[PDB]
Amino acid sequence: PNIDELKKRMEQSRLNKLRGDLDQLIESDPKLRALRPHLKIDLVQEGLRIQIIDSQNRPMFKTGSAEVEPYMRDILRAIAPVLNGIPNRISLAGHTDDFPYANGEKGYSNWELSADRANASRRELVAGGLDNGKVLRVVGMAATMRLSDAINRRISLLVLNKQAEQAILH
Amino acid sequence: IDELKKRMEQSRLNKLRGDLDQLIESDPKLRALRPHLKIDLVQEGLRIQIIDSQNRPMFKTGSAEVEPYMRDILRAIAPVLNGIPNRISLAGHTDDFGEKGYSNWELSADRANASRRELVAGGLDNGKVLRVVGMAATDAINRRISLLVLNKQAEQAILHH
């Protein structure tokens, strides 16, 4: 056996049960089943990555704002207690491109907005039941320069495996 | 070639720490405060920490607005940082002591951005900062702003490439 590669496969299977259950919440409830073209749940390496992405038609937040849309608020609250299902901690990232590139060297740009959207989703997860201490960090990532897709605007929820969280908290 | 280009970046990151302390000793006011400053090479790149003391907090208490000296340290190191391709990851760490409205999560991320804007106004580039992080709280030693100059592999992992 081993004790380092066994807690290490009990986990891959833990995060896999999470992913399977998240899709069950989504598919079997119809309030989120129509929001599915905004949700991508895949396995990366820090753990489980839940992406909640904007569509040209429907953004999750109001233009240039950190106010969640009614349905975004529904996704955050629908998944919160399924996330409490396991002990792993979370990393919430906000990716924003609502403002022009140059507002960057200004007061409230995509930087403040991206952080604010991350904390806004946080407060929402928390309103849905998320246990205290689950969130590990909030990340704000403004969009980079392009010359001259709306995936560029999304909130990512990373359920961290033991490695990743150890690395983030060394 | 791998470690070849990797050793070039290491040597380049070396010039930076060195070029950083240059001004910390040469500028009488960064020197008066070097004991809030901590530049150490980490496995991810060059880490700069701006620590709080018990009389000298970097931000007004409970606020994300910088104190005169925090404003100085940041804008002074900015020109420098800017001389090299390397990008940055800005992290804020709150001190526990308020939880449902405004929390250390909003506070930490806000200090991360308030710092980035001091840098950005101190001449730092536009597109230099890769991300801002609010780590909240997990004594003035945990009320710090950590500024990470990322090496190419540290920054490639963050971008997900």
PDB file of C-alpha atoms in Angstrom, chain A residues 96-97 101 141-146 152, chain B residues 87 127 129-130 159:
ATOM      1  CA  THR A  96     -13.638  40.903 -15.493  1.00  0.00           C
ATOM      2  CA  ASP A  97     -13.580  42.765 -18.815  1.00  0.00           C
ATOM      3  CA  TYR A 101      -8.385  48.524 -20.886  1.00  0.00           C
ATOM      4  CA  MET A 141      -8.196  39.188 -12.394  1.00  0.00           C
ATOM      5  CA  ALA A 142      -8.829  41.972 -14.855  1.00  0.00           C
ATOM      6  CA  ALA A 143      -8.664  41.154 -18.551  1.00  0.00           C
ATOM      7  CA  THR A 144      -5.415  41.746 -20.441  1.00  0.00           C
ATOM      8  CA  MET A 145      -4.889  43.987 -23.497  1.00  0.00           C
ATOM      9  CA  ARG A 146      -6.241  42.787 -26.882  1.00  0.00           C
ATOM     10  CA  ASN A 152     -13.639  36.678 -20.302  1.00  0.00           C
TER      11      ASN A 152
ATOM     12  CA  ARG B  87       4.544  40.203 -13.843  1.00  0.00           C
ATOM     13  CA  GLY B 127      -0.867  45.146 -17.381  1.00  0.00           C
ATOM     14  CA  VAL B 129      -0.194  43.144 -12.178  1.00  0.00           C
ATOM     15  CA  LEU B 130      -1.511  39.679 -13.081  1.00  0.00           C
ATOM     16  CA  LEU B 159      -2.650  31.613 -16.171  1.00  0.00           C
TER      17      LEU B 159
END
